[PDB]
Structure 1
């Protein structure tokens, strides 16, 4: 029953490098809107490219005949910007997309929290670290503009959702066991066993998002990993889409963790998260990023072309895992097949690991953060500078 509604060439604005790119897009009746570098000859649909519950806007800036697909995915507002040659083509696309979207459609207040610290600013709102006065718990509050608009042990849970007169607010649970980059920086390098533990929990969470939620996390990096009070991994959802910063070109964020297919603004899928897994687990066991340099052109080339290299102190099992995870071609990448996470869970690096015990947190955390409870503020104090 799934068929193509409309297909053709489009100019898509790059998601990390702001240049316009010629891409062949396929609009299907299941809601997927995917672009390709070349017209594909050609299973579960990813919600990352869904046009369901989205609003279309027609703009003449910064380029005439531009249309934008603005979507609210979970707790993050995203924008996909496209360009055509003639206004007639734009109307054809916007009508087709809207038609598909139509066919698919077939108390807690702000005074209850205390402002603590600005976590991040985005185009359509901000993220704030708050503390509930009643319980003393820590939370990350996503405060999004109103007019522009599920539990896993290793994912930051959405606690509350409320709105003001002009703002929509999402309340994330905030781990108090400390940032993982802080822990890795302090201890320089994690052992293979400890990295196996963190890695296993990450795999479990990614497996959940892929099979149950049918979504790609795409932001898997060290900065988005935290530990709770018990030392278990928490993958964070504190992000917001920003506008890039002007090396005369304009870039949005740092590219060191981005998958090659994501950098080239090509078709991407579940394999992206496995690349991220490779980057994270590489840094944990090697003590540094897989690809690093100052020039963005250089950094791109290292990610796109340069083969990953390993220290002599790294074991063959770890080398096999990282080599598979950091394959530049997602079709050849470990976990890039139809088996997805099972391809990684069955890898010999995770031999002996009982994955049911992983999800149920039966595995003893090798590291216990110096906190007494979920309200302990040690990783919020001056020590964080040390």
Structure 2
């Protein structure tokens, strides 16, 4: 059961030429695809229905599309549309030519402070948007934080995302295994927006330190350390940065800042935030010099 060379949406009469294989995001296989008329290039996420035999699995895909289609923001992956034939589900998404923060992290390890500040701000701005629209992502991690040609961050993969339907709703189910998973989820006693602030906590730690805060050889031992709040921040991290991390990584979800407080932290308001980064920043640390020489 093999994937067509040209992807035809019958409703909109659009045709997409399947270009280069980008990789396998879970069930899906992703390709560079291009609209035959405009030649505009997108990421095509193609999932075979042979892996969607169970209603539960179908319901999750429908939910992901439902959530993601409703979203439009500078720091959220553009959802351009979706369609399906008897064999496949096709989702047409904003292409992010510079991959994700995971691949950045693997090249550069710990970032410089102004880089972190730069990316974190964009991460926060997109998450503010999600939260304003009553959406919790629930799996914010480096691999889901994509980068376009100008190194702007775009939040993707809404496969674990959920809608808060009513005020003070505490979700008690999360079908999935988030990476930077919050202690309320692991204890399994209900959760909401603060799950994403925890994840942003871990992301900020990873970006500045060069490894994740609760890492071990065993996933269960890692979950153990999250329960006990067992991490520590290196001495060389500046106290303003360290303090913000500490605020975000509290076991009590009610103690963490909300998403809208974050940009007002000293960390942002009293440090250098570059307006943009050069492409060299994928490979070489920037000195942020005051004039060419």
How does the TM-score come out when normalised to structure 1? 0.56
Structure 2 Cα separation of the partners of residues 300 and 330 of structure 1: 16
Determine if contact 2:160/2:176 at 8 Å carries over to the other structure: no
Q: Partner of 2:47: helix, strand, or coil?
A: strand
Structure 2 Cα separation of the partners of residues 343 and 127 of structure 1: 38
Structure 1 Cα separation of the partners of residues 90 and 178 of structure 2: 29
Structure 2 Cα separation of the partners of residues 237 and 255 of structure 1: 12
Matching residue within 129, 138, 143 for 1:218: 138
Residue 285 of structure 2 is matched in structure 1 by: none
Task: Write out aligned runs for 1:38-187 (5 A).
Answer: 107-108=12-13, 112-114=17-19, 116-122=21-27, 126-132=28-34, 134=36, 135=39, 137-143=41-47, 145=49, 148=58, 150-165=71-86, 167-187=88-108
Alpha carbons of structure 1 residues 261 and 240: separation in structure 2 relative to 1, 3 Å: closer
Structure 1 Cα separation of the partners of residues 111 and 224 of structure 2: 28
Query: What do residues 4-60 of structure 1 show as CA deviations (whole Å, max 9, x unaligned)?
Result: xxxxxxxxxxxxxxxxxxxxxxxxxxxxxxxxxxxxxxxxxxxxxxxxxxxxxxxxx
Residue 249 of structure 2 is matched in structure 1 by: 326
Structure 1 Cα separation of the partners of residues 103 and 200 of structure 2: 18
Residue 366 of structure 1 is matched in structure 2 by: 277
Gaps of 5+ in 2: 1-11, 63-70, 162-174, 283-293
2:269 corresponds to 1:351: yes
The CA RMSD over aligned residues, in Å, is: 2.9
2:193 corresponds to 1:270: yes
Structure 1 residue 282: Cα displacement: 0.5
Structure 1 Cα separation of the partners of residues 230 and 157 of structure 2: 31
Residue 129 of structure 2 is matched in structure 1 by: 208
Determine if contact 1:179/1:226 at 8 Å carries over to the other structure: yes
Determine if contact 2:138/2:178 at 8 Å carries over to the other structure: no
Determine if contact 1:275/1:326 at 8 Å carries over to the other structure: yes
Query: What do residues 137-184 of structure 1 show as CA deviations (whole Å, max 9, x unaligned)?
Result: 240324364874531011101112223245443211120013212212
Q: Partner of 1:154: helix, strand, or coil?
A: coil
Structure 2 Cα separation of the partners of residues 240 and 210 of structure 1: 15
Structure 1 Cα separation of the partners of residues 46 and 213 of structure 2: 31
Task: Give the total of aligned pairs.
Answer: 239
Q: Partner of 2:21: helix, strand, or coil?
A: strand
Structure 1 Cα separation of the partners of residues 72 and 33 of structure 2: 21
Query: What do residues 271-310 of structure 1 show as CA deviations (whole Å, max 9, x unaligned)?
Result: 0100110111100101111001122331111111033311
Residue 229 of structure 2 is matched in structure 1 by: 306
Structure 2 Cα separation of the partners of residues 139 and 265 of structure 1: 35
Determine if contact 1:140/1:238 at 8 Å carries over to the other structure: no
Determine if contact 1:256/1:291 at 8 Å carries over to the other structure: no
Gaps of 5+ in 1: 1-106, 242-251, 336-340, 372-386
Structure 1 residue 192: Cα displacement: 1.2
1 or 2, which has the higher helix percentage?
2
Query: What do residues 177-204 of structure 1 show as CA deviations (whole Å, max 9, x unaligned)?
Result: 1321221221221111110110011111
Structure 2 Cα separation of the partners of residues 307 and 370 of structure 1: 32
Determine if contact 1:138/1:176 at 8 Å carries over to the other structure: no
Structure 2 Cα separation of the partners of residues 115 and 282 of structure 1: 34
Structure 1 Cα separation of the partners of residues 221 and 101 of structure 2: 27
Structure 1 Cα separation of the partners of residues 261 and 160 of structure 2: 31
Alpha carbons of structure 1 residues 348 and 117: separation in structure 2 relative to 1, 3 Å: closer
Structure 2 Cα separation of the partners of residues 108 and 132 of structure 1: 14
Structure 1 Cα separation of the partners of residues 155 and 85 of structure 2: 28
2:207 corresponds to 1:296: no
